[PDB]
Amino acid sequence: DWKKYGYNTRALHAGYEPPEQATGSRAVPIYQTTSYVFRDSDHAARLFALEEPGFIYTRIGNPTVSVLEERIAALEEGVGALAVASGQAAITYAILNIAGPGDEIVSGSALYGGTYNLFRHTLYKKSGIIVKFVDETDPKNIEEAITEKTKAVYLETIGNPGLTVPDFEAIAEIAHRHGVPLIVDNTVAPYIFRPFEHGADIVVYSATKFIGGHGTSIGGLIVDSGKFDWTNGKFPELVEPDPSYHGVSYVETFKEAAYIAKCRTQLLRDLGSCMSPFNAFLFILGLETLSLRMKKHCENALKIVEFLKSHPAVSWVNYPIAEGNKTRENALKYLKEGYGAIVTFGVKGGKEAGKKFIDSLTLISHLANIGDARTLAIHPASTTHQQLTEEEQLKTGVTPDMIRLSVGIEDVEDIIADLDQALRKSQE
Amino acid sequence: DWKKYGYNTRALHAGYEPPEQATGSRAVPIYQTTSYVFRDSDHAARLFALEEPGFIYTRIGNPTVSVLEERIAALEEGVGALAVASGQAAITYAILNIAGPGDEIVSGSALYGGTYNLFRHTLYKKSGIIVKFVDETDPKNIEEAITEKTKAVYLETIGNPGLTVPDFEAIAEIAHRHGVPLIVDNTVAPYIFRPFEHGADIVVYSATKFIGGHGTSIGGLIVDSGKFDWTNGKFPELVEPDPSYHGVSYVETFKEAAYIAKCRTQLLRDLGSCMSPFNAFLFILGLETLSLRMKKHCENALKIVEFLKSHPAVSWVNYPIAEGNKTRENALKYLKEGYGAIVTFGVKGGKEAGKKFIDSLTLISHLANIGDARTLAIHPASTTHQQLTEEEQLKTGVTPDMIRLSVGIEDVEDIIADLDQALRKSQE
Amino acid sequence: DWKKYGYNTRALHAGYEPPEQATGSRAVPIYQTTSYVFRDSDHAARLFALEEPGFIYTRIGNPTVSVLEERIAALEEGVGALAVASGQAAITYAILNIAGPGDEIVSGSALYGGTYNLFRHTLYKKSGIIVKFVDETDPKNIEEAITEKTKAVYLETIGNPGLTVPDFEAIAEIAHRHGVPLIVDNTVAPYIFRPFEHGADIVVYSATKFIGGHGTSIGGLIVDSGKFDWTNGKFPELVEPDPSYHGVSYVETFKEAAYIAKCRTQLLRDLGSCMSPFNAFLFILGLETLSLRMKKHCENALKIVEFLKSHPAVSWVNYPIAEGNKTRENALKYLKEGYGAIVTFGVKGGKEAGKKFIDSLTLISHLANIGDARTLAIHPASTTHQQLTEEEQLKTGVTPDMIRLSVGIEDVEDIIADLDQALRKSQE
Amino acid sequence: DWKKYGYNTRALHAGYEPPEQATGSRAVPIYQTTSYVFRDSDHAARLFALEEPGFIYTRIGNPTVSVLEERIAALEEGVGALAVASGQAAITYAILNIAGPGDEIVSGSALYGGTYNLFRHTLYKKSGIIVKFVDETDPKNIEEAITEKTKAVYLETIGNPGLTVPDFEAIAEIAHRHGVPLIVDNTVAPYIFRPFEHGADIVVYSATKFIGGHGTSIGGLIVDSGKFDWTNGKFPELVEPDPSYHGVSYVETFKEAAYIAKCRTQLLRDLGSCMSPFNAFLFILGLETLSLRMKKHCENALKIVEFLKSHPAVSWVNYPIAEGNKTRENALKYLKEGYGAIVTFGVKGGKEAGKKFIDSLTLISHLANIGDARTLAIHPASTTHQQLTEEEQLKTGVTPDMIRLSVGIEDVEDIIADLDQALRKSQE
Structure with missing residues (x-):
């Protein structure tokens, strides 16, 4: 067509x-x-x-x-x-x-x-x-x-x-x-x-x-x-x-x-x-729902961001349109349908607290991927970016305390409840 | 194991x-x-x-x-x-x-x-x-x-x-x-x-x-x-x-x-x-029968070779142990289980006769592949080797009148009957 | 869960x-x-x-x-x-x-x-x-x-x-x-x-x-x-x-x-x-988007119904909540999330006009199914219900001039355009 | 064809x-x-x-x-x-x-x-x-x-x-x-x-x-x-x-x-x-090698039978052409290509010895199936026939001490070695 x-x-x-x-x-x-x-x-x-x-x-x-x-x-x-x-x-x-x-x-x-x-x-x-x-x-x-x-x-x-x-x-x-x-x-x-x-x-x-x-x-x-x-x-x-x-x-x-x-x-x-x-057959199946899926991913992610911004165990949150983001203007100009599924944040207590956040999760999947229908979390500095020096990781926007989330299409209240119980446990 | x-x-x-x-x-x-x-x-x-x-x-x-x-x-x-x-x-x-x-x-x-x-x-x-x-x-x-x-x-x-x-x-x-x-x-x-x-x-x-x-x-x-x-x-x-x-x-x-x-x-x-x-799953399935399949491929190929050597429309036949093959000694020394499924030959009347051989086949598949269970035929100079100059094709053992066969595991009398009717038609 | x-x-x-x-x-x-x-x-x-x-x-x-x-x-x-x-x-x-x-x-x-x-x-x-x-x-x-x-x-x-x-x-x-x-x-x-x-x-x-x-x-x-x-x-x-x-x-x-x-x-x-x-693997994949898909199916179907109700080549339209539907009250009471993807209607000129409607379609698929992501059309009396007598078909709600649509999740303006050109052709 | x-x-x-x-x-x-x-x-x-x-x-x-x-x-x-x-x-x-x-x-x-x-x-x-x-x-x-x-x-x-x-x-x-x-x-x-x-x-x-x-x-x-x-x-x-x-x-x-x-x-x-x-696709793949596979199954089974007949831990062996089989004449008359992959035998020490035979195996698979490329063993009276009374099991040719083998297409010396070590262990 x-x-x-x-x-x-x-x-x-x-x-x-x-x-x-x-x-x-x-x-x-x-x-x-x-x-x-x-x-x-x-x-x-x-x-x-x-x-x-x-x-x-x-x-x-x-x-x-x-x-x-x-x-x-x-x-x-x-x-x-x-x-x-x-x-x-x-x-x-x-x-x-x-x-x-x-x-x-x-x-x-x-x-x-x-x-x-x-x-x-x-x-x-x-x-x-x-x-x-x-x-x-x-x-x-x-x-x-x-x-x-x-x-x-x-x-x-x-x-x-x-x-x-x-x-x-x-x-x-x-x-x-x-x-x-x-x-x-x-x-x-x-x-x-x-x-x-x-x-x-x-x-x-x-x-x-x-x-x-x-x-x-x-x-x-x-x-x-x-x-x-x-x-x-x-x-x-x-x-x-x-x-x-x-x-x-x-x-x-x-x-x-x-x-x-x-x-x-x-x-x-x-x-x-x-x-x-x-594999091609399966990707075709994926395309048939792509627009519905992406709208839900982006709507859930924006809700997750607002939840994290107000939570006591979180020190910072990033998102393409976050107030501190140096390119939010570009995000506003070019993304008119949603701002992506990916969300980063830092836990109070640094790398070891994020460690205990990941270890406590019960519904979000600790794995190496983004873009699954399920919600995913990881610590990039020791995984998707482990091949890079500490200086190199910082050039790409990756710090040592960073948690990356790929927000999925579950019911957002279930995502948020998993995030909250795991953030409470990280402060213990 | x-x-x-x-x-x-x-x-x-x-x-x-x-x-x-x-x-x-x-x-x-x-x-x-x-x-x-x-x-x-x-x-x-x-x-x-x-x-x-x-x-x-x-x-x-x-x-x-x-x-x-x-x-x-x-x-x-x-x-x-x-x-x-x-x-x-x-x-x-x-x-x-x-x-x-x-x-x-x-x-x-x-x-x-x-x-x-x-x-x-x-x-x-x-x-x-x-x-x-x-x-x-x-x-x-x-x-x-x-x-x-x-x-x-x-x-x-x-x-x-x-x-x-x-x-x-x-x-x-x-x-x-x-x-x-x-x-x-x-x-x-x-x-x-x-x-x-x-x-x-x-x-x-x-x-x-x-x-x-x-x-x-x-x-x-x-x-x-x-x-x-x-x-x-x-x-x-x-x-x-x-x-x-x-x-x-x-x-x-x-x-x-x-x-x-x-x-x-x-x-x-x-x-x-x-x-x-x-794909890996299917290759594992293939391995489970590989030795039975290879023995049948090689037994059929050797029979096909003998048939072709005595046929009036065939000008030459090659096989790793053919009498004219410059490395038959190496084939004898190193291949002690069968000499492969691949057979080449030339039709009397050159490239245009081989053309009519391929076009007449009724059971052997005219396609680009080897190693299928089915028997396959092709003209390499215009296909698997078309990316090479006439001088280059000759370096690799490919002439202009050559037919390549990948002999399959059908009943050999059916392979030979397809070969014979198609070789007769190429001389018309 | x-x-x-x-x-x-x-x-x-x-x-x-x-x-x-x-x-x-x-x-x-x-x-x-x-x-x-x-x-x-x-x-x-x-x-x-x-x-x-x-x-x-x-x-x-x-x-x-x-x-x-x-x-x-x-x-x-x-x-x-x-x-x-x-x-x-x-x-x-x-x-x-x-x-x-x-x-x-x-x-x-x-x-x-x-x-x-x-x-x-x-x-x-x-x-x-x-x-x-x-x-x-x-x-x-x-x-x-x-x-x-x-x-x-x-x-x-x-x-x-x-x-x-x-x-x-x-x-x-x-x-x-x-x-x-x-x-x-x-x-x-x-x-x-x-x-x-x-x-x-x-x-x-x-x-x-x-x-x-x-x-x-x-x-x-x-x-x-x-x-x-x-x-x-x-x-x-x-x-x-x-x-x-x-x-x-x-x-x-x-x-x-x-x-x-x-x-x-x-x-x-x-x-x-x-x-x-x-097959089970594929049905699991389907479930992961089912709620998004069903909401879109039902939203498109309700729009299709309104389009058909006002179109000059259409004699009648049915839908669980249509004004003439004898059980619309039950549909209102029990279906609070959407009223299904299935839509029936009749073309002016009877069975032979519906024949020419089906034959003219260019995007909607003339096939036997419902519930595909694609939009589907058919004439039930000669297909999904052909095993039944004329009296029996009428007991199940199937007439001779009926077209059934399974409304898909394409962009509704494209569905409606295919419907309109095909309805115009049925009156020629 | x-x-x-x-x-x-x-x-x-x-x-x-x-x-x-x-x-x-x-x-x-x-x-x-x-x-x-x-x-x-x-x-x-x-x-x-x-x-x-x-x-x-x-x-x-x-x-x-x-x-x-x-x-x-x-x-x-x-x-x-x-x-x-x-x-x-x-x-x-x-x-x-x-x-x-x-x-x-x-x-x-x-x-x-x-x-x-x-x-x-x-x-x-x-x-x-x-x-x-x-x-x-x-x-x-x-x-x-x-x-x-x-x-x-x-x-x-x-x-x-x-x-x-x-x-x-x-x-x-x-x-x-x-x-x-x-x-x-x-x-x-x-x-x-x-x-x-x-x-x-x-x-x-x-x-x-x-x-x-x-x-x-x-x-x-x-x-x-x-x-x-x-x-x-x-x-x-x-x-x-x-x-x-x-x-x-x-x-x-x-x-x-x-x-x-x-x-x-x-x-x-x-x-x-x-x-x-x-599933049909996979069965077609299976057919392409069926005759080679069945010949190997039946050749291995006949060898397994001869091994079992002479082994000190085995009390009896059955096979369609075994000397004691009441229908060996029919097997000889109608099966001219091999006598099947299935072999039964009894271990000295009855049901509990067969128990220890099954439990000792290291290459043969203890599972419910026949006809796999792999060699399989089981105790039918408590599995494939457990739905039947003791009288009923006996009508079908199933006793309490019986081991059934589905002989696969592994190298027979490896099958026999697994059988032998497991038969020795059953007598301990």
Whole structure:
């Protein structure tokens, strides 16, 4: 389905209208298959030469996985999407598509720990890429770090768990004036934020979190807006003839889809971070309720915040629109549908009190995740961010006394009662 | 289970004895979950610091996926295995674990097309790695290409579809004398060949093909023999303190498992090519019959070869032990359980006759795969190897008139009848 | 979880707190297994004798299926539930548990076609049970049909598709004064109606429809309120010693759970209508969003009704609270959360116009189902009710010109636009 | 595929040639769907009236489930099959299709406990059917129990666990001379026995056991040979017009498939024991290796028997061809491919020694099942047959000191070593 239809209609229909014509299955089939029989040899040759569309091999493309991709692109109003094995793989592929040995990336610092470790260590040692980390709360800091080796600017929508919101439009202008795309990780804010409306060229998701929403499946997505001009000379693999496809120019053959086409034909084909069709089936199920779920997550989170602000065992609370938040103005400007499910706070008595808070919980789940329907809590400095030095954790908005909550869609009075009994026990 | 038990007992038990203690499930549960609740904060901290074993997050580790890994390691007599999203990802990770920008790899040339394209283009452009391709039919050619920048030697067990078998022991000696591991891709010969018995240090699989065996699931495996010494100075990431894990030395903490540990803790955690637990469940089912299946594949293939050799529309036939095969001696020496399922031949009348052969088939499936229970046929020069120049295809053992068959486990008289009617039609 | 927690908290937690202790999986594992290893022979004997709780065999009981059952019982505030292969099997088992050859059942006539055919033909010919059908819009009609052979009264919550709502409290009093339970089929109104609050003793569900909510899985549920007294002499199988379990009296051993215990130990064990653990996994996912989904279904349906009432191609519209509905008073009294997703209407030009309405639709799915997230339409007289005579269809509230809609959770303006273009085309 | 193709070719192809034409999926898709969109209203009407073939609703029919059914029918050389939720449901439906209140069934007594309990108690109390149990080791005993109320004769292929084999041809003649079909439960002997070659008219399977073969899925099958004449006056529901389908005569419309058609259209539609498409997918995977698996099961079992016969802690051993077996002649005559996987024996020291045997095992699984790839052991008198009196257990071939083994496909020396250490411990 198209831009003329509403978000919820797309979330239920896009990419699977009409149903497959073999049997009419209303539900998207799970095509748990590796291979696809060809009509004849000409079919088979056209498919491999990129001269006709069809399925060849599940590593490269699969019908269940394609419905997921098409529906995500429709919801984002992008020109195409690619599904991959994890949010990490989506980030990896989004960068590696346009960068390699000797290249630079300007990144914000309000980052999930796993992105930090990929950027700072793995991409440098295994791909020769230098990521330059900046305080994205001031857009001038992004401009000052761009160089002729920069290939992209990278931001998260709501800094997990710093809870800062960058000025997307200002930073997108900076990236475009310097001839590079803005890539946004919108993991924590599907539906409530549309990056392509605000300057982003590329969106990645950890479909694992909110998109799936039920804590069952690992997966990632890369979405291409199709509006960046790859021919400025900084992205020659998207322009020059590709020896692997006998001379194909991606911009020439695939036009506005050049980028997501190469992600598939080069990186997915060769590095092989494909999603399972079963996992795709479950993510499609998640999308069908995503907007209802996100509205409830965000309504509960705002209530949780107000509860915590007035509680005697709590020393501070953060939320994208909290009074002390340095980017609340950006949160107000760009998030008009809810301000995310993630809430941080500190317990009086520091790290050891937070320890006893976590240990006392009876309904909230002490685990490593966000974006489950259930409410989740953790201590980031010793978990999601343990790979970082004390100085590094502070750059990303992570302190030693911090508790992160991913607020779920339980009845809020039950969440608050678990929080209260556990906060009382932490002061004993 | 251990080295004292037979292959089939291990294939049915290793890694899941005793059954999980929650309910006693005899079958391996499908843990379709992202996360795992922790006992308390100390548990959670020990797990992330690598100070205690347990599950944290399915990208990094999962109980269903772990049973698969443990059973593959037991069958291989390796010290550990890692599961990943595809055979391509396993190859990628096996190399990237020990190589990066400016490094070299010596590879054989009897290679699946997808490995060629990863080696020649993707790893060079995205990782700065120079793969040097050699004629592995003479081990002297491997020695002559090693340099001080070489990090590994790479071979396939039965060249897909050149059908050549390298001299593993001679090449393993060369690699070890030069301080680098031998990595073997044993995709086409699980059970019938044990690389670790013949000098290989690392084995990778495309679990997709024969291990799964039913054409349902994409997946890869990396298996570590645990016998290579990573401390010779060429593998400093396996020895030096890792900043991402606050100073952990992989050889010191994980000893013989240093390599497969870093594959998990670095590459899987950051690049994110994880396998789905559903896919793992299906690969475990495949292992339970693998030895029966491989014996039938190889018995049928040898019969198919004899049929083709005497048929009037066939100009030539290849098989690892065919009289004209330049490495039949190696095939005889190393494959004592069967000589693989893959068979090549040429039709009289060249490419256009093979075209009409493929188009006439009625039971054999014209698709891109090997290792299905069903019998498969294809024309490689325009498909699995289309990414290669005419000169390059010839280096890998692929001609323009070649038909590749993956012989399945149907009743051989039905396979032969389909082959015969289609060969008659190709001469019209 | 317990009656102290809210509906949404239960829907996310009940039956799986704490997570399984083997690994801590936050998601409910898919235990796709037939069998469960026993600790020793005493364990195994106690389990089969009904002297200890545990798992023995998936036909009889399974850990994934048990979580589903426990969560449904918690949401219903029943004492237990049983999962089965379909809504039809749940109805069958709910009756067969308490009735057999020579017994009677008093049923309402506002019935899904499949229930009618089971009641009128299959149970009579294969079980000797006489179902007496009555106009349940007047409770006096239920009393007048009870006899000393009656074993239960049976009602649907919202007559599918007559859209009538019975007076539950009045009819429950009648059944209880005559010593028989009231069994309610609450398929179309989970969450929005709680039968046990209004006199029902037994609830059955077609988990297929709204509970699943995504059109993926067939399944049924039987829920026992635990408040009916089975010892009045009409239910001797629940009281007398059971030879199959060496003398067990169900009321004595299982107390308030006697009924659902026999459903498992007798009917599920012997007739074998078990649910798959995969299907159960998906129904659990459905429950996690059920209340959000049902509120949206009912809000959209009420809007659709208002649209249809004012449209020139529509001759009439029905809805439980429509002005002409003979039971709107009951709908107002008992449904305080929404009035269901099902809407009927007639097109001007009769059966052939409705034909052209269905044939013109472009977003609404012409299929046999209700309770999908997508909007569905059909012509019942030739489909869901085709097994009934013209007189019989009229007894159930089905006319020849009727269109049934199951209103989904798409954006209502998109539903209405599809309805309007198709209604215009029907008048051409 | 057809009778011209071999068993293994059929097991890999029948029912899914050609692959679905939407995408060409070589693997059978998992159609996890409830519903199927119709082309238009005429389509929808023809489908419900039984005037055209197609899919309507997964309770009644599903594309994945249909491939399973078609492949089983092809392997059996039957005219059709029906899939159901369990082996118990298949037995139930096979009888209820042709019998009801006041009818009789002549059954053998060499029966799985669950069949006994269905026959003796559940079908009598819930369906009014009188099963007459006879010593089927003498065919004269079958003739002497037939009456004008008899509707079928029922046998198991290898009495589980009496291990007796009836004289199928003699008993089939008796049933046919008296105008009733012979129904065979071939659960324990797929592939190794073809009941339709020896007089059976109807075959049922517990697909759970050997057909699946991996202990993952519950399921049943009913297979119709299509050769019984239902018009002799004893089966009027198969001849007379069916009110539920407006006058359809099953023999007239469906001809040789009348029986399996009514199983679907009446019993599956109304009692609702449908199989999940996921479970069907797994059973199809099992079929692909069934013949290799059964040959290995039977070869290992015969070796286990010889080991047990010579062991000092064993007092007796039974096997269909054991020297003391009263039906070894029948086993020799009818089983020409292997004599089943099931082995019974007694330990010196009686029930308490067998207790200590079971408790000592370290590789063989103490669970309730047969037909897993793994080797299984149990004590039937307190488990699979606990529902029967001491007299009743003895009628079925079950004593108090009996150990039943389901011999798996592990390496036999590992099975024997587990058996030996556990037999030594039982004598302490």
